[PDB]
Curated annotation (Swiss-Prot):
Domain SEC7: 15-136
UniProt source species: Homo sapiens (Human)
Subcellular location: Cytoplasm; Membrane; Golgi apparatus; Cytoplasm, Perinuclear region
Coiled coil: none
Record text on subunit structure and interactions: Homodimer. Interacts with ARFGEF1/BIG1; both proteins are probably part of the same or very similar macromolecular complexes. Interacts with PRKAR1A, PRKAR2A, PRKAR1B, PRKAR2B, PPP1CC, PDE3A, TNFRSF1A, MYCBP and EXOC7. Interacts with GABRB1, GABRB2 and GABRB3.
Free-text function comment from the UniProt entry: Promotes guanine-nucleotide exchange on ARF1 and ARF3 and to a lower extent on ARF5 and ARF6. Promotes the activation of ARF1/ARF5/ARF6 through replacement of GDP with GTP. Involved in the regulation of Golgi vesicular transport. Required for the integrity of the endosomal compartment. Involved in trafficking from the trans-Golgi network (TGN) to endosomes and is required for membrane association of the AP-1 complex and GGA1. Seems to be involved in recycling of the transferrin receptor from recycling endosomes to the plasma membrane.
PTM note: In vitro phosphorylated by PKA reducing its GEF activity and dephosphorylated by phosphatase PP1.
Gene responsible for this protein: ARFGEF2
In-chain residues carrying the UniProt-annotated modification Phosphoserine: 61
Tissue expression as described in the entry: Expressed in placenta, lung, heart, brain, kidney and pancreas.
UniProt disease link: Periventricular nodular heterotopia 2: A developmental disorder characterized by the presence of periventricular nodules of cerebral gray matter, resulting from a failure of neurons to migrate normally from the lateral ventricular proliferative zone, where they are formed, to the cerebral cortex. PVNH2 is an autosomal recessive form characterized by microcephaly (small brain), severe developmental delay and recurrent infections. No anomalies extrinsic to the central nervous system, such as dysmorphic features or grossly abnormal endocrine or other conditions, are associated with PVNH2.
Descriptive protein name: Brefeldin A-inhibited guanine nucleotide-exchange protein 2
Effect of residue 145 to E: In a breast cancer sample; somatic mutation
Length: 179
């Protein structure tokens, strides 16, 4: 008929318990395609899935999952921070050390693709920003206007990033704390 008595929500309840079982059930009944552009076009598209469960998926050590994360980045000119926040809005940034690296490696290599010095420069810049959207709630002193610049010294090979850039960056996230 014209209706759609299609599951596609049971898979959602399943993905939120087990990502590996959820993204396979959908492919079992024929709702989700194979490859990686399908699955990556699912975590990014269908926003009704736990953000912690989506953020843990793409930050998995699997060689099939690392591909499932690269296609995720390859979907979504603008300010650097205007890209970090956009990257981190779809999921809950995972607190695991090895996972954060897997994400900021592909985000820095994808940005530096379409000021700065290398992809390693955006890489460490991304982390200083995550070291500021988390810093700006139980601490009396905040990150100094004088600091954060003296602290980020030596990020372009041997030199600093324009002090006007780190400043324009500072004022943005202290107003709107991405996450």
């Amino acid at each position: 008929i014209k209706q759609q008595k299609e599951i596609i929500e049971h898979g959602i309840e399943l993905f939120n318990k087990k990502p590996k079982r959820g993204i396979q059930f959908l492919q079992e009944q024929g709702m989700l395609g194979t490859s990686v552009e399908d699955i990556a076009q699912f975590l990014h598209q269908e926003e009704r899935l736990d953000s912690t469960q989506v953020g843990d998926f793409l930050g998995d050590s699997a060689r099939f999952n690392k591909e499932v994360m690269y296609a995720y980045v390859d979907q979504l000119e603008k300010e650097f921070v205007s890209a970090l926040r956009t990257f981190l809005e779809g999921f809950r940034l995972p607190g695991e050390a090895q996972k954060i690296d897997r994400l900021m490696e592909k985000f820095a290599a994808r940005y530096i693709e379409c000021l700065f010095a290398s992809a390693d420069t955006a890489y460490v810049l991304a982390y200083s920003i995550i070291m500021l959207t988390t810093d700006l709630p139980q601490v009396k002193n905040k990150m100094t206007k004088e600091q954060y610049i003296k602290m980020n010294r030596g990020i372009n090979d041997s030199k600093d990033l324009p002090e006007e850039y780190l400043s324009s960056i500072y004022e943005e996230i202290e107003g709107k704390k991405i996450a």
